[PDB]
Amino acid sequence: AAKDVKFGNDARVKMLRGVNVLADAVKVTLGPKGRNVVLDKSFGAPTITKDGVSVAREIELEDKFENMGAQMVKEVASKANDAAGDGTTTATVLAQAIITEGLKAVAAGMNPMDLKRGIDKAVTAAVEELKALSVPCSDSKAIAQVGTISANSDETVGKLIAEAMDKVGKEGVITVEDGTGLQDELDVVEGMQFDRGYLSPYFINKPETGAVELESPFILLADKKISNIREMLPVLEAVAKAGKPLLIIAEDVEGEALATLVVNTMRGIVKVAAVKAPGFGDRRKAMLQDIATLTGGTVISEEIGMELEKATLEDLGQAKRVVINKDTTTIIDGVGEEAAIQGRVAQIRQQIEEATSDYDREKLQERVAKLAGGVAVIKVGAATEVEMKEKKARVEDALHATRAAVEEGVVAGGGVALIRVASKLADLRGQNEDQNVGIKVALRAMEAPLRQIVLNCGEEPSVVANTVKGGDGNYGYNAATEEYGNMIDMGILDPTKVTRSALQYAASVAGLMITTECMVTDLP
Amino acid sequence: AAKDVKFGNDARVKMLRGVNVLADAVKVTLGPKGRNVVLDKSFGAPTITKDGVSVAREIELEDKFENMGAQMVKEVASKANDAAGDGTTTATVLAQAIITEGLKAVAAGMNPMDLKRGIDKAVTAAVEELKALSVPCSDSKAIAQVGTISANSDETVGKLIAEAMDKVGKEGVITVEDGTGLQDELDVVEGMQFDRGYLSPYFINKPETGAVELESPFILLADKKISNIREMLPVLEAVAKAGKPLLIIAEDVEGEALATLVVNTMRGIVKVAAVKAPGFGDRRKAMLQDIATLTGGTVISEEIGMELEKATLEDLGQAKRVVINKDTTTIIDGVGEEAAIQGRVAQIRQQIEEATSDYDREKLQERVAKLAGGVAVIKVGAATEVEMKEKKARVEDALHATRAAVEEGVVAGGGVALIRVASKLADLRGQNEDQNVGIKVALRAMEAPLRQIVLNCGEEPSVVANTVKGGDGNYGYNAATEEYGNMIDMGILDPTKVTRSALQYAASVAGLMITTECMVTDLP
Amino acid sequence: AAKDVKFGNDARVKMLRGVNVLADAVKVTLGPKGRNVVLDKSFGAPTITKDGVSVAREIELEDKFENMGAQMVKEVASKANDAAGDGTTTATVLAQAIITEGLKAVAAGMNPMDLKRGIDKAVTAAVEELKALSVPCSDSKAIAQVGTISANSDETVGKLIAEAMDKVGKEGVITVEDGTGLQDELDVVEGMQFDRGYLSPYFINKPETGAVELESPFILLADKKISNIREMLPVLEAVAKAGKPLLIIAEDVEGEALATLVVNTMRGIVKVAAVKAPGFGDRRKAMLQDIATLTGGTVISEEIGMELEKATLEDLGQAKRVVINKDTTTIIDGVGEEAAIQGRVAQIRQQIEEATSDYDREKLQERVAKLAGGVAVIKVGAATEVEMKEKKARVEDALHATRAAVEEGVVAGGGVALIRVASKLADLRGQNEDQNVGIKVALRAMEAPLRQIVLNCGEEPSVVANTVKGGDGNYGYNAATEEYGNMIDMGILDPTKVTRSALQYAASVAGLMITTECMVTDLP
Amino acid sequence: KVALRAMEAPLRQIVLNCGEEPSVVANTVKGGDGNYGYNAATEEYGNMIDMGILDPTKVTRSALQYAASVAGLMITTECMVTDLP
Ligand SMILES: Nc1ncnc2c1ncn2[C@@H]1O[C@H](COP(=O)(O)OP(=O)(O)O)[C@@H](O)[C@H]1O
Ligand SMILES: Nc1ncnc2c1ncn2[C@@H]1O[C@H](COP(=O)(O)OP(=O)(O)O)[C@@H](O)[C@H]1O
Ligand SMILES: Nc1ncnc2c1ncn2[C@@H]1O[C@H](COP(=O)(O)OP(=O)(O)O)[C@@H](O)[C@H]1O
Ligand SMILES: [Mg+2]
Ligand SMILES: [Mg+2]
Ligand SMILES: [Mg+2]
């Protein structure tokens, strides 16, 4: 409908004020001494979090022009989270510093577009510098330090995470779930496992809980539902000749087959249990080949040249044992060759290098870990429920941070890396003076993440920065201990990827944001 | 949508005031002299209760920030109820004292994150102390004392509950129902009983009331409904041959089976009555195996290897006698070996140790009680329906408290245990001064439950506390008798579990709550 | 219903003000130093653009009469975009200049109709001048310069665009898609390709990802779907006999045909893969003739005179090899005579000059490019989503501008061409004085685009223009370098078509707009 | 702590008025000893008395004693009385 128009300074002032509100709320959660922010929920109990991105999503302003400024700055915090899942609070601070200084430059009559180019060039130079500074983080102690630092300096979190990454491996999958107790627990899963129950509660091999343990079983994979069509007897009787247990994978099994099966198992003629496939057509069908190849078995292609009783005992896969409960089925170890195992993994490389990334890579990776790596689950400890989400969320941030630290390395924390790189870039200049100022402005903004940490500690942000700048390399001030030294020695580490991403995302929105002459919005 | 934001002290002050309103309403219901709170309902007659958790649920505030404070403290009261079902009012009081002192520390300029750690560390130390103070609750008199104390010092309640736990047993099930009369009454049921009536009103053995008593009957368990499938006559005949009564359990019996059956029972050929299974198929089928094993019978596996005709007379379970009426069927004692009964119970151990807890365990235990234990029902007397609500509610609290006291033991009441443990922890300090203050803050908050009891009695909370602190061991002040002495001697007992849970839940919410810098809420 | 009516002077003032608001918002985005405009969305995050047409669309006014003026000027910006996709901001400026001066003439008591046609005569004369000044632009450097100038002086954009036009050719199709990285990337597609995957994932010729490469394959085109009328064996057998791979194009291929086909391909009997036709009935059927003629094959006309079985091996088309994946099918090169390729293209000439224009020629040309030319895709780099649309939008404007520059040539930029033509037309007069004033008004308005650019920069618009007028030929002022010289040397180019279109569209609406005596609108 | 911390403010105020960093100047001044300090007029560090910037000991004392006297006096005040508009 009809819209309100603001030009130049009036538009920018409202924009900045909106930006300041969002940024101020986000800043208080930054650092070891960072403070919690509570998001009010109508639906249920209020949520308290130290996560800047979570706070950013919630904030919208009554003033349409101020709101627009806040909405645009909101995205940098949101984008940083997508990139690495950490440093979102830090990224917002850089946007605050850049925008305020950029607008100040704009007031002078300097061309904003030139200022943007200066900032962008400064950013590009800064990114290259970060890569040179990044030190590899391949040791468990360093990994623990990043986890601990991400989790608002919780030593126990870093400790548990380090244990898990070493254990699962480089390509393994680690997740976190709410714990029943007040104590944090770690679970490690060995071999292939999936969320399938047994269709025959009656057949329990030994332990109670519906637990089935088959010793050196034959594994069958099929593409069809089994009901009245019994004809598969020569395959099933072949198993009887062997005197070994049979594991069945198919779309479904109904009582007719199960009825004969339960009696056959009861008298010891055959020890056989049947379970349903993984779940969805493109899902379960895709995961069947790997199960079969891993166990050395053959998938029955209903679709291709195969039939229900057309398939010898040769076709069935072999495993030393399987554990089945009402909710899950696990194979101890299917017997298959590494070349086939690795080969299945090798064909997975296209699957791994997929445009979708989110959703596709994590489930896919799960197969990868199940096929050769492993799966780890972490339980979170806390007395009620509000404590549990906060504790849990930070652990995930640490989980994401460690994954990032391993792949791209780490840099000194406390904002020292950005301030240290700024000194390095003091000689960078552009096409004209407006660009030179823009460059210089970006360098100025680099300092802010460091000083927010100090500010939140109730100490002079400027005084600490002057001494830190005075220092060399990794020298910096530890907010927790309230003293100077070497940041790396202390254990305060920033994954290079989050540091890099924060600066780039903050700068990307900020350059365009400062160049806005006119803003348009609807009246109340 | 659009957000209203408060920072620092303004946020915390609003939060505190909201918490104070919630806690003030809760406090008046704490102690022997505690007073009732009336909750209004547009639906019908208002509910009056001394139960703090119920009062907490109903409190919501007009001020959006104040409401946020109250909503967060609401959870500690509610969480405590989930754990033990008692001490919810006491837990709220601890939250009140911890929060007020914690915020005061925050005002001082101390880092709240550190304050939280001090509190959390202090809580862990306090919990360990409670276990050492805790003494076993085994005798009936002590159980009665906890029941009596829980039910706002009602002696009759403690007396009746003690009789029931001893009588039913350690794993027995106790419930409470309203009473027809003005007097409290206890009902105890032994053997296997269920809420199933008879399909044939016509077959009444001796007492009229739909009452069927069969002497040395054979019990039939089935997985199908019998409409036109009257065939099974050789089974029925085998029973006619036996000359013994027949009890029938199956999904349903139609008039066709009943019609022939009625004539057969009336002229003396056979005495047979049929009743429909427990209710829902997974649930009825699950309870059928125990019924058969308990009576030494065999469940007919229509599903597995059994048919309607196929089943010998010996398959049927045996019992001394059964009692049947329109609403319920009861078996005096099925004849089964002690080992088999115990064995079903043994497989139930997985069932007992279930992640579900709520609902699954209650029903599970009921099966277990029927299998080997006993079931008790308590009726509550009162002239009016609302009086009945208050009286009954307190009885349940005592029931939960006794269950808690038996499993985890008891500690001295009147808040003496928390104040007594506080003296012990005077030696606890940590990483920094802010933590030390946080620890100290928690110790001070410990005192509050004791003083609220005294405050509600119209006496100086501080003066009684000074003498209590002055005392040793279990020495304390009895609010009801208005004098000092040994609390254990008095008969005032606090189950260790409720006391521990209250402190833990109160502190966990309080630690995060005191660390809040910014609050977000919707506009008026 | 019930209309508010304004006459003469009051109506025109309201109209002018509405126009001025719209124009002023548009004006700030004109030039190298032009500034961005942010459009607020209730849906997602706000949009930031320098594109005048996008801004014009979003502007609606609270005052009903002013809004009417704004809506009326909105079309000139919208029409310019439709004609060339560039020059929309400039067109609005001309409308601003013409209308303001025209209204002033109206105020004098001059006949508006005479003023309007005087303007129209001047416009027609100005257009003729533009063709004379227009110079060819067939060289890559000049094309790059227009791309760079359109993209708000971004050199990298102009460089990449020039490369694509040269390589795909005159009739090639170029589109732009968001890039995953922070860098710009160019993709070129050669040969015949369509967006359809394979219905047989099982048959992969060599590389994974479903990549199928058939060497010297036969191509089958059909108007059929195949279920159980597999009966095409004589055709399939003929191919088996030849030992060559088969590619199948038809409405659908399913289960039974694929099942047998899969076994045949795996064991080496035949190497055959099938893919679904292009998409919709007439659309896919229309594209079948070209596929078959290109490959030298014959489409199976179910409808005309051919049967499923009926078709010899010669009917099938031949290609060197094809590339197939899960979402795309590509033919390296079908062997077909150029006379046939051009002949297919020749029948396309009617298709090319189709009244539909929008949509029809774009897709039609895509077929054309696939038939003989090439297809190019450009990817745009940016850290965040808001940067991404702005960067990409400008690239599209440049893409459209280059297309316009090639077909109609270019003129010197900075508004120099309009100012230069205006000096030439100083001798143009009409039937009466009122027309003569209108002519003069048009010439006067021509100057404005030049001065608006300078005004955006921050320099005196009149001073620069006075010196520019003093100059000759292509002499002008470069806003970005802040100096005078030859605009062509500089690399500042305006496609003749956008320049011409802006002037004609602005003038057409402006003439009618200044002739308004009375306005009709609804009440508040 | 309130009294000691309050002492710092006049220095900071001097520097703040000048448009210089109060925290940075205060930090460096704290490091020094005796009459060493920052001269706001000349923007440099040295012996303030030698430089020519000084206050009588009596005025500094009197200002500090009165400020504390009134502050404490307000802190202990529980009631205020005035006429309505
Ligand atoms: N104890 C500490 N001492 C000094 N710096 C710290 C300490 N803990 C964390 N930091 C730093 O401050 C930054 C922000 O903390 P954090 O709240 O985790 O923000 P993110 O949420 O990481 O923006 C870190 O990336 C790190 O460099
Ligand atoms: N007669 C009494 N004398 C002293 N203390 C008592 C007496 N009765 C109860 N108390 C104490 O006060 C607490 C609060 O009573 P209650 O109403 O049951 O609150 P909860 O609802 O248990 O907070 C008890 O747990 C107990 O320690
Ligand atoms: N650096 C420059 N120096 C002088 N003129 C320029 C420069 N850059 C662009 N222009 C001119 O100003 C016009 C407006 O730019 P543009 O934003 O693309 O508007 P349109 O969107 O073209 O109205 C161009 O068509 C061109 O002639
Ligand atoms: Mg973090
Ligand atoms: Mg109680
Ligand atoms: Mg343009």
Side-chain angles (χ1 to χ4, degrees), chain A residues 29-31 50-51 85-90 146-153 393-394 397-398 401:
Chain A
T29 60
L30 180 70
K50 190 180 180 293
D51 190 348
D86 200 0
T88 63
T89 300
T90 300
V146 300
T148 300
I149 200 70
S150 180
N152 190 205
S153 24
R394 290 180 299 92
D397 290 340

Side-chain angles (χ1 to χ4, degrees), chain B residues 86-87 149-151 397:
Chain B
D86 200 356
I149 200 70
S150 180
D397 290 340

Side-chain angles (χ1 to χ4, degrees), chain A residues 90-152:
Chain A
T90 300
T92 300
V93 170
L94 290 170
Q96 174 67 285
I98 296 170
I99 292 170
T100 300
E101 291 300 300
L103 296 180
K104 181 180 300 176
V106 170
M110 290 180 180
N111 185 42
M113 296 300 293
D114 290 339
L115 290 170
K116 180 180 180 296
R117 290 180 184 96
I119 291 170
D120 290 340
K121 185 180 180 176
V123 170
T124 300
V127 170
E128 290 300 300
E129 290 290 40
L130 290 170
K131 290 180 180 249
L133 280 70
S134 176
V135 300
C137 177
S138 60
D139 60 299
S140 292
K141 181 180 180 264
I143 291 170
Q145 290 180 160
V146 300
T148 300
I149 200 70
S150 180
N152 190 205

Side-chain angles (χ1 to χ4, degrees), chain C residues 501-513:
Chain C
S501 291
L503 180 280
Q504 290 180 327
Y505 291 141
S508 180
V509 300
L512 290 170
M513 190 180 290

Side-chain angles (χ1 to χ4, degrees), chain A residues 316-481:
Chain A
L316 299 172
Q318 290 90 50
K320 54 180 180 240
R321 180 180 290 168
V322 300
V323 180
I324 300 170
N325 70 320
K326 290 111 120 264
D327 290 312
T328 300
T329 300
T330 306
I331 300 170
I332 291 240
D333 190 350
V335 179
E337 290 170 0
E338 290 79 10
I341 296 170
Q342 300 312 111
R344 290 290 297 167
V345 170
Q347 60 100 206
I348 300 170
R349 295 290 176 272
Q350 180 60 50
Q351 290 180 40
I352 299 170
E353 290 180 350
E354 190 80 70
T356 300
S357 183
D358 190 290
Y359 215 160
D360 180 281
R361 290 180 180 183
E362 60 180 277
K363 290 180 300 176
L364 180 150
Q365 255 56 47
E366 180 180 350
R367 180 188 290 163
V368 170
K370 290 180 180 296
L371 290 170
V375 180
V377 180
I378 300 170
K379 291 180 180 176
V380 193
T384 50
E385 180 180 350
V386 300
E387 180 180 355
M388 290 291 290
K389 290 183 291 176
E390 180 67 343
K391 180 63 170 296
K392 180 180 180 176
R394 290 180 299 92
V395 170
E396 290 180 278
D397 290 340
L399 180 284
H400 289 85
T402 60
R403 290 281 180 77
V406 170
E407 60 180 274
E408 180 180 350
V410 300
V411 300
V416 70
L418 283 70
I419 190 163
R420 187 64 77 264
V421 300
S423 70
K424 291 180 180 320
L425 300 180
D427 290 340
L428 180 60
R429 300 246 140 43
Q431 290 180 161
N432 70 340
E433 181 60 10
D434 290 340
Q435 290 179 340
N436 290 337
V437 170
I439 294 170
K440 201 70 170 180
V441 170
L443 298 180
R444 188 180 300 138
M446 290 180 180
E447 290 180 271
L450 180 149
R451 60 183 64 209
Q452 281 289 318
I453 300 170
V454 170
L455 180 61
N456 290 159
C457 295
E459 290 180 90
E460 344 271 65
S462 64
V463 170
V464 170
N466 290 339
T467 60
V468 170
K469 290 180 290 176
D472 299 309
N474 290 155
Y475 180 90
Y477 180 90
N478 185 340
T481 60

Side-chain angles (χ1 to χ4, degrees), chain B residues 222-233:
Chain B
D223 290 281
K224 70 285 185 176
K225 56 180 180 245
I226 300 170
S227 44
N228 57 264
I229 46 180
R230 219 280 170 272
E231 290 180 80
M232 51 161 296
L233 281 88

